[PDB]
Ligand binder design. Structure first.
Ligand SMILES: [Mg+2]
Ligand SMILES: [Mg+2]
Ligand SMILES: [Mg+2]
Ligand SMILES: [Mg+2]
Lengths: 296, 297
């Protein structure tokens, strides 16, 4: 299978006066490239995909594709929906905009059955010829892609090559790779990046890497090179910031941190997301001081 | 003070035939609800597969509901909600413009706004129209919860917001809500516990079961509203088996299966990612239905 693995960043989407700051978006991706990142994920959850128009989806994907051109950094585009017909269309659009692959979130809110999840992703995989990474995050979607469903999709569909897991369930990570060791298990939960990698996961899709791309890329590359002592050391150092970046729902804390670091010009969200509380604003700022933040 | 929409209400299924909304069937199903004592119908909610309908299909279903209820007492409480506030405001404005009597607006799903974000979300919705707004809390589907404090603030701060449809399995929260703000309309969004919610001062239901058994749900609600709790509880107890089997798989898979088994819709068709139930659950649904008298057309 064609795969997209390694250290990846779920990119924030900076806003300035209610519009996507396209220059800031390009500068942030170039910053990721210069700090060892292997792929970027535009318009995912951390990028506020729910509140972006389709034209803004296309713009962000195009900026990512063309900023990464000629650098070997891949673009794993967020392209998913809780309506299969729409998810198929988003997969095709992402392929047309130049993405190297897609990250396709499990259907949220309508709680499909395992059979429904299988038919959903099978329709997506058959619509394109680029890699498809499943995304399991039951705390947000209200459903879970079971291990049996993930493994069936991996084996039955050429393009489906693994799964991003954000489920706080290292037992499931053992379950997946013990029964199907050929799949690419990707960490979607920064605080446990090292445990997932040390069990044979092959990458991360990171929130923290928006702020500390060098540290997350180093962590991942230490781990893939089987230097677990050094990968764990970074994972341990990062725990405090990895936890504070979820003191409110992602991406509220990470955008706050990027703003505090001078990496984006304005702390702007689209409703229903909004600024954190003043208490959590102060907590984020104090935790950041312990970390060396790369500039541009 | 506030304009309200209460009583026995039905979360309408959306029938499909050959991949399209069966518009004739939809109208015939709404008339059946009206004729069996239902006080309001909810087009294109979750039970109506709102997620997989196009906007043109959203408009069509709301227009059919509005047209079918004209000249009756039955109200149209349109599903109009989104996890993007800008879109939820437009859907609310569009539902009002299409003639809906009020809107049911689900809490933002998937992106997990904070309580402050939820407050600003619903305030923007409420300020965009002049028709009643009912909040919808269903944390098992959205991944977030509208807290009691947030609900009460919205009820008190926004003229149009008159209550909440709760589907949280949390009778403690129902006490909390009506004890601190007894003026709000608490609406059951969970059929099995319709009677407990009503008996604590809830003023209506938005029901899945009433798609199949509208006369029974209507009777339950109106007995309860008249404080004939013995009759309301008796119906609630009798309905427990069907109320539970209708969630053996994710709603609306079981209810559409039951409606098809009763001959009330022509085709057992969903839009992916929804699909037919397992053969075992299909049989379980069929067996439980045999204990109930299902009204025809
Ligand atoms: Mg590399
Ligand atoms: Mg949409
Ligand atoms: Mg038709
Ligand atoms: Mg009476």
């Amino acid at each position: 299978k064609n795969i997209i693995i390694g250290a990846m960043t779920a990119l924030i989407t900076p806003f300035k006066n209610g519009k996507v700051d396209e220059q800031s978006y390009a500068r942030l991706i170039k910053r990721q490239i210069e700090n060892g990142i292997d792929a970027v994920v535009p318009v995912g959850t951390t990028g506020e995909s729910a509140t972006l128009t389709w034209e803004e989806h296309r713009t962000c994907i195009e900026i990512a594709v063309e900023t990464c051109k000629g650098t070997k950094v891949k673009v794993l585009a967020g392209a998913g929906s809780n309506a299969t017909h729409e998810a198929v269309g988003l997969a095709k659009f992402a392929k047309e905009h130049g993405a190297d692959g897609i990250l396709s979130v499990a259907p949220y809110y309508n709680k499909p059955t395992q059979q429904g999840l299988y038919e959903h992703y099978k329709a997506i995989a058959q619509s394109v010829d680029i890699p498809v990474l499943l995304y399991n995050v039951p705390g947000r979607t209200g459903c879970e892609i079971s291990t049996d469903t993930i493994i069936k999709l991996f084996r039955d569909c050429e393009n489906i090559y693994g799964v991003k897991e954000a489920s706080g369930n290292i037992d499931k990570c053992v379950d997946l790779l013990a029964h199907e060791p050929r799949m690419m298990l990707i960490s979607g939960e920064d605080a446990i990046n090292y445990p997932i990698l040390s069990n044979g996961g092959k990458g991360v899709i990171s929130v923290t890497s928006n702020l500390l791309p060098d540290m997350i890329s180093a962590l991942t590359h230490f781990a893939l090179d089987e230097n677990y002592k050094e990968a764990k050391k970074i994972n341990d150092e990062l725990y405090n910031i990895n936890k504070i970046l979820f003191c409110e729902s992602n991406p509220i804390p990470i955008k706050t941190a990027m703003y505090l670091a001078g990496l984006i010009e304005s702390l702007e969200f689209r409703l229903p997301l909004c600024s954190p509380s003043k208490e959590n604003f102060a907590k984020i700022e104090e935790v950041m001081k312990k970390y060396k933040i790369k500039g541009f």
